[PDB]
Write a protein that binds this DNA or RNA. Structure first.
Lengths: 220, 32, 125
RNA sequence: CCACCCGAGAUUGAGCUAACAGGUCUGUGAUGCCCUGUCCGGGGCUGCACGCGCGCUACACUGACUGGCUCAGCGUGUCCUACGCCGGCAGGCGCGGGUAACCCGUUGAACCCCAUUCGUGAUGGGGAUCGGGGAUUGCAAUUAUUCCCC
């Protein structure tokens, strides 16, 4: 019956799809059914242009109720369509990662070592410099992924910070104003939340630091 | 110098620096 | 270590990059003797001929130009080549050499270092 | 804005609402003057002896033709266009980008620069006026809409 509900998500009529899209969310959030439905989601993307938009909308709010292996498989599958240069599928898949990180999942849903692979993978897009539609969303998730990675393991969290602040300083040169406002708003919220309470455990830093204090040298 | 000439100078001076610093397939899999 | 300057004409803007080398001058990837108007070849070669081939032997200059026209670019190229050398001899050679370069380079023609403040006049209703 | 110290006093009493050169809405004066069109087709909208004014192209050698080389800026748009195929050209068919310091567009502009032919000849200067054909927009191209070839 769950597969009967699920198989109507790909339906061409929007009303039938809209209730099924809302129906699947209420069933899972309200889980043993999570594993099978992710296996449906991956194979449908591999089968296919218009249907993939509905499937990424399905994957938008269904990533948080997944286990580790299926997130790892989904993290590949969302990353495969990134190789396609189509823009609407790119923006939805960018926004799909946002809803993954905005829920701040636990250790059973998302491991600490998984996030390091995601952020290092996402460095290869950085779209050009000045398109403003995904670039706001691109550095919105790199904010959201880093703030989640710090919360799980903090001393690794300072390890991945300098490379992001390498691009964040560099992307201030984009001629769009809304890039500038969103960039520093991302950077300030990392510093007010990921560095400020954990500053005391670091202690005083010199020019020849070794451990996580060396990251703070690379911040400044 | 003025706004219009300096905008072109700064943009051009930046691009000469990049071609001094300048002198693959994207990682689809995340777990090796 | 290197020095990054600019020289300008009406709209033809140049940028020059000078560093240690054996004495090659390139504009837009082309040599100084292949720049297209060959009638005004001496205007490109004036800062080289006034100063001497030996004085440029310790520096390699690469110049990029965009905008303007055929002769406005030559007047910007010859400005930024000479202006790159007087900046390089100031920061990494003693000021006595920089004063004597800036001396003989102004008495010849004042546009090799100080730009021409002439631009097209707008029209109003 | 509120509370408070000092301070006689951090506000108590006498005068001022008013208006429509914008007008509107159909109520009145047996109010002052003065008289008793719609749809459809076709045509031309400068047809040209002349007087008076703008402009464009030229009368060539500091030039025309052919090839090659090499440089802009203000602006532009959901109408600007990229790319592929076909034709010799105007022009067709397909598929994409851009509401825009994001695409056109590193805006590959023209004089200019370098080679070739021409050689003072109403001439390879100059292009009007014409003949024949082709293509595009439009209900419609005749009195040549416009463009291309000889």
């Amino acid at each position: 019956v769950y597969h009967g509900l699920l198989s109507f998500t790909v339906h061409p009529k929007p009303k039938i799809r809209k209730a099924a899209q809302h129906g699947v969310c209420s069933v899972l959030k309200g889980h043993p059914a999570a594993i099978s439905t992710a296996k449906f989601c991956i194979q449908e993307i591999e089968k296919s242009a218009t249907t993939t938009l509905h499937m990424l909308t399905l994957l938008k709010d269904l990533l948080p109720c997944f286990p580790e292996g299926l997130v790892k498989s989904c993290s590949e599958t969302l990353l495969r369509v990134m190789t396609l240069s189509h823009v609407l599928v790119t923006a939805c898949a960018m926004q799909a990662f946002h809803s993954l990180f905005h829920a701040r999942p636990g250790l059973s849903t998302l491991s600490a070592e998984l996030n390091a692979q995601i952020i290092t993978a996402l460095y290869d897009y950085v779209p050009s410099e000045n398109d403003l539609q995904p670039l706001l969303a691109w550095l919105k998730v790199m904010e959201k992924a880093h703030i989640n990675l710090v919360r799980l393991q903090w001393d690794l969290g300072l390890g991945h910070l300098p490379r992001f602040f390498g691009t964040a300083v560099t992307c201030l040169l984009s001629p769009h104003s809304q890039v500038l406002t969103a960039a520093t708003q991302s950077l300030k919220e990392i510093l007010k939340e990921c560095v400020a309470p954990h500053m005391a455990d670091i202690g005083s830093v010199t020019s020849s630091a070794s451990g996580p204090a060396q990251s703070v040298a690379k911040m400044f | 110098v003025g706004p219009r000439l300096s905008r072109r100078i700064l943009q051009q001076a930046r691009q000469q620096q990049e071609e001094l610093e300048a002198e693959r397939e994207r990682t689809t899999r995340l777990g090796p | 270590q290197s020095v990054q300057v600019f020289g300008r004409k009406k709209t033809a803007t140049a940028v020059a990059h000078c560093k240690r080398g054996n004495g090659l001058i390139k504009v837009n990837g082309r040599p100084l003797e292949m720049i297209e108007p060959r009638t005004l070849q001496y205007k490109l070669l004036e800062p080289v001929l006034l100063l001497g081939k030996e004085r440029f032997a310790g520096v390699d200059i690469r110049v990029r130009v965009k905008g303007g026209g055929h002769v406005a670019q030559i007047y910007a190229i010859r400005q930024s080549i000479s202006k790159a050398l007087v900046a390089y001899y100031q920061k990494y050679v003693d000021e006595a050499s920089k004063k004597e370069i800036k001396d003989i380079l102004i008495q010849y023609d004042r546009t090799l270092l100080v730009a021409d403040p002439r631009r097209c006049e707008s029209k109003k209703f």
